[PDB]
Design a protein around this motif. Structure first.
Motif, mmCIF file in Angstrom:
data_model
loop_
_atom_site.group_PDB
_atom_site.id
_atom_site.type_symbol
_atom_site.label_atom_id
_atom_site.label_comp_id
_atom_site.label_asym_id
_atom_site.label_seq_id
_atom_site.Cartn_x
_atom_site.Cartn_y
_atom_site.Cartn_z
ATOM 1 N N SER A 106 0.837 -1.191 0.000
ATOM 2 C CA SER A 106 0.000 0.000 0.000
ATOM 3 C C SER A 106 0.873 1.242 0.000
ATOM 4 N N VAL A 107 0.309 2.330 -0.510
ATOM 5 C CA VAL A 107 0.929 3.646 -0.466
ATOM 6 C C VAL A 107 -0.029 4.562 0.293
ATOM 7 N N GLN A 108 0.464 5.718 0.732
ATOM 8 C CA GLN A 108 -0.387 6.685 1.413
ATOM 9 C C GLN A 108 -0.504 7.963 0.579
ATOM 10 N N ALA A 109 -1.716 8.520 0.521
ATOM 11 C CA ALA A 109 -1.945 9.751 -0.238
ATOM 12 C C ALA A 109 -1.306 10.966 0.441
ATOM 13 N N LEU A 110 -0.547 11.726 -0.350
ATOM 14 C CA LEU A 110 0.026 12.995 0.092
ATOM 15 C C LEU A 110 -0.967 14.133 -0.121
ATOM 16 N N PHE A 111 -1.892 13.925 -1.056
ATOM 17 C CA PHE A 111 -2.903 14.907 -1.425
ATOM 18 C C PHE A 111 -4.232 14.211 -1.679
ATOM 19 N N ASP A 112 -5.318 14.958 -1.492
ATOM 20 C CA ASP A 112 -6.623 14.534 -1.999
ATOM 21 C C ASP A 112 -6.551 14.369 -3.505
ATOM 22 N N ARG A 147 -8.642 10.628 -0.200
ATOM 23 C CA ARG A 147 -8.275 11.819 0.558
ATOM 24 C C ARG A 147 -6.840 11.697 1.025
ATOM 25 N N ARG A 148 -6.210 12.844 1.224
ATOM 26 C CA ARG A 148 -4.907 12.900 1.873
ATOM 27 C C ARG A 148 -4.887 11.997 3.109
ATOM 28 N N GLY A 149 -3.847 11.171 3.222
ATOM 29 C CA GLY A 149 -3.698 10.281 4.375
ATOM 30 C C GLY A 149 -4.311 8.895 4.169
ATOM 31 N N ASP A 150 -5.131 8.736 3.137
ATOM 32 C CA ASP A 150 -5.713 7.418 2.845
ATOM 33 C C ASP A 150 -4.644 6.424 2.411
ATOM 34 N N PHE A 151 -4.899 5.150 2.683
ATOM 35 C CA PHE A 151 -4.046 4.064 2.216
ATOM 36 C C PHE A 151 -4.641 3.409 0.990
ATOM 37 N N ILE A 152 -3.815 3.275 -0.044
ATOM 38 C CA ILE A 152 -4.235 2.689 -1.304
ATOM 39 C C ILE A 152 -3.413 1.428 -1.532
ATOM 40 N N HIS A 153 -4.102 0.291 -1.675
ATOM 41 C CA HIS A 153 -3.432 -0.949 -2.062
ATOM 42 C C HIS A 153 -3.086 -0.917 -3.550
ATOM 43 N N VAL A 154 -1.798 -1.036 -3.868
ATOM 44 C CA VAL A 154 -1.347 -1.000 -5.256
ATOM 45 C C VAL A 154 -1.587 -2.335 -5.958
ATOM 46 N N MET A 155 -2.109 -2.256 -7.182
ATOM 47 C CA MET A 155 -2.366 -3.449 -7.984
ATOM 48 C C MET A 155 -1.524 -3.506 -9.252
ATOM 49 N N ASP A 156 -1.138 -2.340 -9.773
ATOM 50 C CA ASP A 156 -0.253 -2.270 -10.943
ATOM 51 C C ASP A 156 0.541 -0.971 -10.918
ATOM 52 N N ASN A 157 1.836 -1.081 -10.644
ATOM 53 C CA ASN A 157 2.725 0.078 -10.578
ATOM 54 C C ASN A 157 3.614 0.242 -11.814
ATOM 55 N N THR A 199 2.753 8.292 -1.632
ATOM 56 C CA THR A 199 4.106 8.011 -1.174
ATOM 57 C C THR A 199 4.120 6.642 -0.502
ATOM 58 N N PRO A 200 5.266 5.928 -0.531
ATOM 59 C CA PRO A 200 5.347 4.724 0.289
ATOM 60 C C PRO A 200 5.166 5.057 1.751
ATOM 61 N N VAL A 201 4.674 4.079 2.506
ATOM 62 C CA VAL A 201 4.369 4.257 3.918
ATOM 63 C C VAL A 201 5.651 4.485 4.723
ATOM 64 N N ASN A 202 5.593 5.446 5.637
ATOM 65 C CA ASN A 202 6.773 5.886 6.394
ATOM 66 C C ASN A 202 7.409 4.813 7.276
#
Length: 56
Positions: free
Chosen positions: A2-8, A20-30, A53-56
């Protein structure tokens, strides 16, 4: 992983994955440098890589 949103991200058409900013998105195709496939909020779709961004 997963990555985290830096912006909405405001989706402008069907098939774009809103979040939204701060949401976690599971990546399926990068593979594309600019638009990635992912999942969040019970949806899947495309979103701009440079909003996240990748998770801190």
């Amino acid at each position: 992983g997963s990555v985290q949103a830096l912006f909405d991200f405001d989706p402008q058409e069907d098939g774009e994955l809103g979040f939204r900013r701060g949401d976690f998105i599971h990546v399926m195709d990068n593979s594309d440098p600019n638009w990635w496939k992912g999942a969040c909020h019970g949806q899947t779709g495309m979103f701009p890589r440079n909003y996240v961004t990748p998770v801190n």
